[model samples]
Target chain A: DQLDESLRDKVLQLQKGSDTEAQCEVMQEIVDQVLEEDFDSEQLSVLASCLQELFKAHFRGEVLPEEITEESLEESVGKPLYLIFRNLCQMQEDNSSFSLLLDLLSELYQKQPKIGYHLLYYLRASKAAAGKMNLYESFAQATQLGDLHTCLMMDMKACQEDDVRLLCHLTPSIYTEFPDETLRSGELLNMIVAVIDSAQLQELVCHVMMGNLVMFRKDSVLNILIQSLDWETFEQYCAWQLFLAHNIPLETIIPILQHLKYKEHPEALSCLLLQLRREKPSEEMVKMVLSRPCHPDDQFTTSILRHWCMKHDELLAEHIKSLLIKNNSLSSKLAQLTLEQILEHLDNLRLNLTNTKQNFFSQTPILQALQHVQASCDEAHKMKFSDLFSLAEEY
Target chain B: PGSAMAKKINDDIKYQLMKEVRRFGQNYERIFILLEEVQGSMKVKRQFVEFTIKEAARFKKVVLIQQLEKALKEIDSHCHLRKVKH
Candidate 1:
């Protein structure tokens, strides 16, 4: 719709694609000038609508009247965004989200160079466009890199799912995907894992490790993983891998991880542990181990043992702990294992994890790795991120 | 509530078990460490003595054994750490 200025309802409109950017800017200026002259509401609305459509046709810029500057984001998205992000970098400021977004954007750019490049420039230009006449500050003039640091650090509390996904797509690296975006980027890892359901967390660890580890040397629960073996042989290969890798005597980790969580698991791990320890586990013996009733304890067990063992490393423990606390029903255990116990249980734990009868090493390594990874995850209140996201975002 | 008696009896047994298991596990762990360290095969075959010793610690305490069993169960579900795909 064109602007209707005269009482006779004469309309004025821009010719289609006549001027890509400059003409649109002139038209918008004219609209503003007319409004300043106090046109009646009907006349103003018509002109405003016309100018809006003209602008909307070419770009998704900011709403008018509100200057699209570094500090103005709070009124709309409520967080600093891309423009403020670039300035932080050029100025060497300490914006914690810098590395994370950089990693994510770099990866996103790798995936689709043109779109990423356009976004990269658009965001870097956003801040300068503010307090100036043009949104695309001339490429060479006093080029003030928009404060991307501010943009990256801007709060994301109100951004929609598409925004979240877009931001995430921009920074798809494993390191960037974590929950923590501070000096501790591993926080993001914790956040992502925290969002994952326990079973999936376990699956992720196994998948990531098995899919990633080199053949033979760093094996999953089922050590012999070649594709040619029969199902029985493959089962044995997996059993062996589990038996070897998990039995590494991680001390206290051994017992907690292996406790029976269910009452009716026919192939009880308790019995499996009994035979795996023996000097000679013949094929018949292995069969016997698989066919028997593994004891299910009186206790309702949790995956606490594996949780402690894996999470004890680096920032994982604090990260996991903080995550768990968010969900009310959670707790941690005391570390009292002697060195010998740790080594011994760690060895057995290794075997249980890697002992594959069929082809543990070749086909199913990742499947096995995740068992422990998930064991570590599901014991308590790890479903924090999803819990919160569902409450807030997922309608 | 019979505090002294309870304390005395529990302490005595707990301390004693801890002491014995600690020694047993330590001695066994040493042998295992040595086996791994001795790369060159010579006079004796690499014994699983350390592994066995570790096993002893695992079985000694019902709690520890239970935990080991749990870890094994987890490994089992995922085919002992390698996933199964049809």
Candidate 2:
């Protein structure tokens, strides 16, 4: 009891010193002595009480009507208090000391919300007391204090699904308050994608994030999206709608498209292709799309073939013919097109004879689709079908 | 050169070199190559090099020391150490 009283008095004497160095000297002496001596719970409470007094005085004194800023608060109170808190948190070997420290911190938070919140951040950031405390509740306290950026800066790997839901709920506000700071935190973006389970909420968050982030950090934001985003959820949300609306570079969007599970989300593939067609997508982009397996009647393939029929791209023409023969379903659009156009498609296929040998066009479905088409067309198209049949026979 | 002072200086150099070699951690081959690099200039005796290698192998175990052949080949190609053909 006597030792605790003397230690309390020594801490109070810190206010009398004018120089920060002398104050720190006394502060360190108090910290070192307190740590060295194994104080009981009651004695530690006395020390915590005195330190709380020191914090309240400096915190309130600096925040007078004259106006106090983070710089002044940091220099006057943060430095010494950080040392005390760090050492105390490190000294926690059992529940007794740990609970006492938690009680002290709770008291500090209740008394001085802003400074107390910052101190919590200090300890959490330094990783001294992070594991011992409830981080989600601490995160909520940070949010209540309007310090979401600081909260986001913490390693939120401990956060649960609902914790990310809270982040998603506040994302718009987070962007409003700290636009640049919030967007630059790539981990926060990654966390939302990796943790959030609700498809609608994931889409909402992705929409808001990509809407803003694509405008600022285009490459980095898209790279994370490609690497981490749940594509099924992204497609369900039509999250790419924002990319299309923003006119995000196709160079960046193409790799993401290539990475898509096209077999599952063919509509997303078709939608993107339809949008890119309006922009006169390059030959490489067209080839990349055609290489993906699609139903015979897929609109993008029909449209691409129709557009390229006039230009006579043999590889593309050959690819469309292969799709029709492979899937054994002649597209309605192909059926309605002029004989010349169908001949143009077949003529191109015939010209690429090496491609014919490799494509194995001798299949029953190939002959069936051809026999069906030959039965419908006039003499000119019929003559071309005979030639195609003769070419197939040679193979 | 036969004086006690010369003997003291030689002991000090050996001690410092051994200390530096130990600081290279598990990359024992780098330590051996480093010793080889400084051998002629520092007047390191041939017996000391052979003895150090033997001690390092014994302490660290033969399994790791056996990797020294591959490590030496890589270091020779990349580091461009003097080609001392045996």
Candidate 3:
């Protein structure tokens, strides 16, 4: 009446390697019966003991020759072991059965580390197996084997959200163990980007990436950030600040500015342009910025127009003239601002010239620019700044 | 006269004008102004004449179309001699 007697006989025949073909068939039948919930806890314990004996016999240099490769060992022991563990993983709803299997596995891992390592490999390879098992427990076991890379490489979509969150949070320590070239390649950064979904996690990942990875992989890091991140988010702004704090070249930051949806978030564009202005970008670059359309009332455009008027560069002056001709509403606000800035520059030039006893020809181009600005104005704008126009004419 | 040299200069100017055209995105008004800015060159004048013809037809600018057609006719008088046979 003892089922352990029958199961133990079957396991012994499998270990003895006598008529293995027939014994394997019989053991598979027993496994199927066990999966059908036909076995009680006592019977399962007897079966676990039988499996442990078979594993010990094979690995303890008693059953197979010592020169056999691991591949053959896996075939002889790993295949059956995987079948049992995978079935147990799916049977997790049966609390007692699953708990017994976990205990068996933990004990087996302590006694037979090689078999335990291969079992982890089997679990990671199967999506359903990995999904159903306790990922934190598995990760801890993997850490003991120095196999965190295998854990990191598991399919992120198959893992639970909490499991992924834990992994992302621990990325810094895991990354530290990686070699230098591996870290420099941005592979881990890409993995983090691919796996992370929540903004809070993404912000943490971005902070970690910028702190360490950006030094060597600036383009790769910035490109990934630019393409993946929501430019309007505060986290992205913080990342931009970090880039500037590290003194990333202005040219490198230009693409970020160019791709911004300035119509929706004009303030972001304003912030970047204000920062870049200290670097004294060329006239063509400033013209490129102004060429992008903004609302006539937006202060960014007005300020850019003022910057243009102060340059006294003929090409910029012509570009502004054409810009005003095309947009009458822009000309209204822009023409007045343009005249005011030009008049200020003219006054500054005249003062400097008088002090040094310099010729008035230095003021010729500024006056000419002033005349051009007045000419670009509409009748309403010219009338509004009539006195300023008269003052320019007197010059 | 060195016809080959003259052709090379004309091709270079056209290439430069096309490069400028590439920078203006989708705004036909800016492109039209750029065309006008270089209209002193014969190649650009030809481009201006042809571009205005197409635009005028789209907008039904009858007078503008007539003016461009006349300009094109004058350009064709010089261009016909250099026309290649298929």
> What C-alpha lDDT values do all the predictions have?
0.31, 0.48, 0.48
Give the 10-residue window scoring lowest on summed lDDT in candidate 1 chain A.
A133-142
Q: List DockQ for all candidates.
A: 0.01, 0.00, 0.01
lDDT (10s digit) by residue, model 2, range A1-395: 44556565666667777556667667778645544445654564455566666666554332222334444334434456666566555653454444444554555444444543344334334445643434334434434354655654442433323244334443453444445555555555544444444453445646555664332246555664553344333222334444454455666656555565634545455566666555444555544555433443334444554444434445444554554444334465544453334444454445444432344344444454555555555666566557675644532
The candidates' interface RMSDs, in order, read 16.0, 21.6, 19.5
* Per-residue alpha-carbon lDDT of candidate 3 for residues A1-395, written as tens digits (9 for 90 to 100): 25555555666666666454565575666665554454554454445555676656444332232444555444444344556565566664446545545555555554444453344344444554633335434434434454544434442222222244434434543444333423444444444443344454545646554664232235555564454344323334444444454455666546554466644554356566677556445544554465444433444544544444444345444554444344433445665564444344334333333444433323445345556666755577567555545655856
Worst lDDT run of 10 residues, candidate 2 chain A, spans A60-69
- Which ranges in model 1 have alpha carbons more than 4 Å from their true place? A1-12, A15-17, A31-123, A126-395, B1-86
lDDT of 1 at A374: 33
Off by over 4 Å in 2: A1-166, A169-212, A215-238, A255-262, A294-300, A303-395, B1-86
Q: RMSD for each model, in Å, please?
A: 29.2, 20.0, 23.6
TM-score of chain A of 1: 0.24
Off by over 4 Å in 3: A1-160, A163-211, A228-232, A270-274, A304-395, B1-86
Tens digits of per-residue lDDT for model 1, A154-234? 222112111332322223222222213322222222223212333433443454355421112222212222211212222
